[PDB]
């Protein structure tokens, strides 16, 4: 009979914003946010440009979709589950699709759907090679605003002992 789970390790999501001088250089400012690695994915550092994905962008239509440059970090904000009665894919599947399409890592704002978190710590479907992080509250909010207002940002998911 199992017991209280080991608590899930913190994913330190550093978000870099950057400006480009005319000559060629780059000043950057950084922004430390926090979430959790889940059983659904790996527990390893990862890094790449951020790209929002609408949660219906990720379906197995077989319908030819845009080639995004390999190595992007997906950011997906989930909707209340009663808005979506019947998903094309489980939250697991959406992760799996993003990777197929070149995502080096994926991050869910679950703040509006808490079930997801346990749906991702099930781990009965196969767990991915790349990290799958979940975030909420002020951190998730902070992240969505960047996506919304900044023209480009880079995400560095970090793992520490």
């Amino acid at each position: 009979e199992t017991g209280e789970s080991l608590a899930k390790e913190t994913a330190f999501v550093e978000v870099v914003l950057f400006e480009s001088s005319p000559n060629g250089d780059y000043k950057t400012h950084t922004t430390e946010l926090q979430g959790r690695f889940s059983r659904a994915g790996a527990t390893i550092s990862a890094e790449g440009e951020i790209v929002q994905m609408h949660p219906l962008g990720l379906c197995n239509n077989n319908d030819e979709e845009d080639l995004y440059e390999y190595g992007w970090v997906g950011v997906v904000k989930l909707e209340q589950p009663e808005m979506d009665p019947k998903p094309c894919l489980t939250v697991l599947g959406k992760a799996k699709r993003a990777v197929q399409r070149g995502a080096t890592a994926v991050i869910f704002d679950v703040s509006d759907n808490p079930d997801a978190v346990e749906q991702l710590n099930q781990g009965l479907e196969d767990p991915l090679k790349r990290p799958v992080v979940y975030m909420k509250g002020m951190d998730a909010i902070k992240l969505m605003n960047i996506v919304n207002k900044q023209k480009g940002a880079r995400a560095r998911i970090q793992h520490r002992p």
């Binding site: 219906l56 904000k77 969505m144």
Partner: protein, 103 residues
């Protein structure tokens, strides 16, 4: 914004559309959000799936109106229509028809 949406969030735009319209994922920098359109934008064609209708980008070199993913209806000025596709010069095997621009 947020026109045609059945439901509509701040962060994802439209999520589902009204019955007759078309779902279109506008990419705009890091963002991507829903729009629910009357007809699909230039460069796109629509697909009326059982579940939902939605836009897809063309991807046929030298097309001007896609119908489906693999069929063009109006090629570019200066171009030959063949098995759906568009050709500067009409590929080997067959050649242009007199008075017509097809092959």
């Amino acid at each position: 914004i947020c026109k045609g949406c059945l439901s509509c969030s701040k962060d994802n735009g439209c999520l589902r559309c009204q019955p007759k319209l078309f779902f279109y994922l506008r990419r705009e920098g890091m963002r991507q959000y829903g729009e629910c359109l009357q007809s699909c934008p230039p460069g796109y064609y629509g697909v009326r799936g059982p579940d939902m209708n939605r836009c897809s980008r063309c991807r046929i070199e030298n097309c001007d109106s896609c119908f489906s993913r693999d069929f063009c209806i109006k090629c570019k000025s200066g171009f030959y229509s063949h098995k759906g596709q568009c050709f500067e010069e009409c590929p080997e095997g067959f050649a242009p028809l007199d008075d017509t621009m097809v092959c």
